[PDB]
PDB file of C-alpha atoms in Angstrom:
ATOM      1  CA  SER A   1       2.179 -24.151   5.724  1.00 17.10           C
ATOM      2  CA  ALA A   2       4.442 -25.587   3.028  1.00 18.83           C
ATOM      3  CA  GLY A   3       3.102 -25.158  -0.502  1.00 18.15           C
ATOM      4  CA  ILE A   4       0.809 -22.351   0.645  1.00 19.89           C
ATOM      5  CA  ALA A   5       1.444 -18.721  -0.291  1.00 22.84           C
ATOM      6  CA  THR A   6       1.710 -15.997   2.343  1.00 23.59           C
ATOM      7  CA  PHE A   7      -0.141 -12.713   1.852  1.00 25.54           C
ATOM      8  CA  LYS A   8       0.265  -9.409   3.690  1.00 23.34           C
ATOM      9  CA  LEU A   9      -2.418  -6.955   4.785  1.00 22.64           C
ATOM     10  CA  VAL A  10      -1.660  -3.313   5.556  1.00 19.15           C
ATOM     11  CA  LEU A  11      -3.915  -1.829   8.233  1.00 21.40           C
ATOM     12  CA  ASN A  12      -4.616   1.857   7.633  1.00 20.52           C
ATOM     13  CA  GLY A  13      -8.002   2.502   9.236  1.00 18.24           C
ATOM     14  CA  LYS A  14      -9.150   4.973  11.890  1.00 17.83           C
ATOM     15  CA  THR A  15      -8.403   2.762  14.891  1.00 21.27           C
ATOM     16  CA  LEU A  16      -7.058  -0.330  13.135  1.00 24.03           C
ATOM     17  CA  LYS A  17      -3.374   0.207  12.370  1.00 21.21           C
ATOM     18  CA  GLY A  18      -0.394  -2.100  11.873  1.00 24.24           C
ATOM     19  CA  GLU A  19       0.341  -5.240   9.860  1.00 25.23           C
ATOM     20  CA  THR A  20      -0.998  -8.782   9.594  1.00 27.93           C
ATOM     21  CA  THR A  21      -0.615 -11.805   7.322  1.00 26.18           C
ATOM     22  CA  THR A  22      -2.478 -14.938   6.255  1.00 28.01           C
ATOM     23  CA  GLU A  23      -1.849 -18.285   4.588  1.00 27.97           C
ATOM     24  CA  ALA A  24      -3.811 -18.780   1.369  1.00 28.55           C
ATOM     25  CA  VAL A  25      -3.759 -20.548  -1.997  1.00 27.05           C
ATOM     26  CA  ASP A  26      -4.661 -17.365  -3.870  1.00 29.69           C
ATOM     27  CA  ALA A  27      -5.467 -13.670  -3.481  1.00 29.08           C
ATOM     28  CA  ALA A  28      -9.196 -14.407  -3.404  1.00 28.94           C
ATOM     29  CA  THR A  29      -8.828 -16.647  -0.355  1.00 29.47           C
ATOM     30  CA  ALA A  30      -6.416 -14.216   1.298  1.00 28.87           C
ATOM     31  CA  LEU A  31      -8.954 -11.403   0.978  1.00 26.00           C
ATOM     32  CA  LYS A  32     -11.715 -13.535   2.490  1.00 26.32           C
ATOM     33  CA  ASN A  33      -9.474 -14.367   5.444  1.00 26.04           C
ATOM     34  CA  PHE A  34      -8.509 -10.709   5.820  1.00 29.03           C
ATOM     35  CA  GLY A  35     -12.200  -9.830   5.621  1.00 28.81           C
ATOM     36  CA  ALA A  36     -12.923 -12.021   8.643  1.00 29.97           C
ATOM     37  CA  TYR A  37     -10.059 -10.368  10.517  1.00 30.82           C
ATOM     38  CA  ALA A  38     -11.353  -6.864   9.806  1.00 31.12           C
ATOM     39  CA  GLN A  39     -14.879  -7.870  10.815  1.00 32.33           C
ATOM     40  CA  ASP A  40     -13.714  -9.206  14.178  1.00 34.85           C
ATOM     41  CA  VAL A  41     -12.127  -5.835  14.937  1.00 38.83           C
ATOM     42  CA  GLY A  42     -15.161  -3.855  13.823  1.00 38.04           C
ATOM     43  CA  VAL A  43     -13.686  -2.695  10.516  1.00 37.38           C
ATOM     44  CA  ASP A  44     -15.067  -3.021   6.992  1.00 35.79           C
ATOM     45  CA  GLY A  45     -13.742  -0.264   4.735  1.00 32.48           C
ATOM     46  CA  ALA A  46     -12.190  -0.087   1.269  1.00 34.11           C
ATOM     47  CA  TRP A  47     -10.512  -3.284   0.076  1.00 34.18           C
ATOM     48  CA  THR A  48      -7.617  -2.914  -2.361  1.00 39.74           C
ATOM     49  CA  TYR A  49      -4.576  -5.005  -3.274  1.00 40.18           C
ATOM     50  CA  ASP A  50      -1.937  -5.741  -5.904  1.00 39.72           C
ATOM     51  CA  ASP A  51      -1.429  -9.392  -6.829  1.00 38.51           C
ATOM     52  CA  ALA A  52       1.996  -8.503  -8.221  1.00 36.26           C
ATOM     53  CA  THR A  53       3.366  -8.193  -4.690  1.00 34.69           C
ATOM     54  CA  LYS A  54       0.658 -10.058  -2.782  1.00 34.19           C
ATOM     55  CA  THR A  55      -0.102  -6.893  -0.820  1.00 32.14           C
ATOM     56  CA  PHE A  56      -3.504  -5.972   0.601  1.00 29.79           C
ATOM     57  CA  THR A  57      -4.667  -2.713   2.161  1.00 26.75           C
ATOM     58  CA  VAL A  58      -7.793  -2.020   4.210  1.00 26.49           C
ATOM     59  CA  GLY A  59      -9.159   1.158   5.780  1.00 28.87           C
ATOM     60  CA  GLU A  60     -12.387   3.104   6.284  1.00 28.57           C
ATOM     61  CA  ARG A  61     -13.054   6.608   4.966  1.00 27.63           C
ATOM     62  CA  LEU A  62     -13.579   9.572   7.289  1.00 28.69           C
ATOM     63  CA  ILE A  63     -16.756  11.629   6.933  1.00 29.71           C
ATOM     64  CA  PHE A  64     -16.868  15.385   7.510  1.00 30.61           C
ATOM     65  CA  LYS A  65     -19.627  17.997   7.372  1.00 31.07           C
ATOM     66  CA  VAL A  66     -22.294  16.637   5.030  1.00 31.67           C
ATOM     67  CA  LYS A  67     -20.066  14.290   3.033  1.00 31.47           C
ATOM     68  CA  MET A  68     -21.706  11.049   1.922  1.00 32.96           C
ATOM     69  CA  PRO A  69     -19.954   7.685   2.144  1.00 34.24           C
ATOM     70  CA  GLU A  70     -17.610   7.175  -0.806  1.00 33.80           C
ATOM     71  CA  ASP A  71     -18.721   4.900  -3.639  1.00 32.27           C
ATOM     72  CA  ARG A  72     -15.349   3.210  -4.121  1.00 32.71           C
ATOM     73  CA  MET A  73     -15.382   2.157  -0.470  1.00 31.17           C
ATOM     74  CA  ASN A  74     -18.925   0.783  -0.571  1.00 32.25           C
ATOM     75  CA  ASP A  75     -18.274  -0.911  -3.912  1.00 30.96           C
ATOM     76  CA  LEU A  76     -15.126  -2.753  -2.839  1.00 31.41           C
ATOM     77  CA  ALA A  77     -16.732  -3.764   0.454  1.00 33.58           C
ATOM     78  CA  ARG A  78     -19.882  -4.921  -1.333  1.00 35.85           C
ATOM     79  CA  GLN A  79     -17.880  -7.213  -3.612  1.00 32.45           C
ATOM     80  CA  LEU A  80     -16.290  -8.915  -0.607  1.00 32.49           C
ATOM     81  CA  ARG A  81     -19.500  -8.994   1.428  1.00 34.66           C
ATOM     82  CA  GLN A  82     -21.255 -10.869  -1.375  1.00 32.38           C
ATOM     83  CA  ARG A  83     -18.553 -13.518  -1.027  1.00 35.39           C
ATOM     84  CA  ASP A  84     -18.703 -13.734   2.766  1.00 36.53           C
ATOM     85  CA  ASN A  85     -18.312 -17.410   3.654  1.00 36.36           C
ATOM     86  CA  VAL A  86     -18.724 -18.307  -0.016  1.00 38.11           C
ATOM     87  CA  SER A  87     -16.334 -20.889  -1.456  1.00 38.49           C
ATOM     88  CA  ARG A  88     -18.081 -21.167  -4.819  1.00 36.69           C
ATOM     89  CA  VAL A  89     -17.173 -17.641  -5.908  1.00 36.48           C
ATOM     90  CA  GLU A  90     -13.769 -16.152  -6.718  1.00 36.17           C
ATOM     91  CA  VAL A  91     -12.617 -12.566  -6.208  1.00 35.15           C
ATOM     92  CA  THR A  92     -12.106 -10.391  -9.282  1.00 33.69           C
ATOM     93  CA  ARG A  93      -8.496  -9.211  -9.465  1.00 36.22           C
ATOM     94  CA  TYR A  94      -8.048  -5.587  -8.407  1.00 37.90           C
ATOM     95  CA  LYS A  95      -6.857  -3.237 -11.150  1.00 36.80           C
TER      96      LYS A  95
END
């Protein structure tokens, strides 16, 4: 779509691997779209990106022995989940 930015998502999960893109007006919208994608394919792991290059990455952490789920994963996911189907809230830029 003319006038609309294109964003890239890198897929680096356990079973979800490859590349996909979305049309969006900003990174916040792109993430929300990518969120929906990940959900449809049964994935909801760590969500990181760099606005400088318009690059997103998603993937879930592997658990071994008695390891607990990582906080960075749950945190990043939480931030997106709170914005699930919310248009009134923007995404804080990843640093």
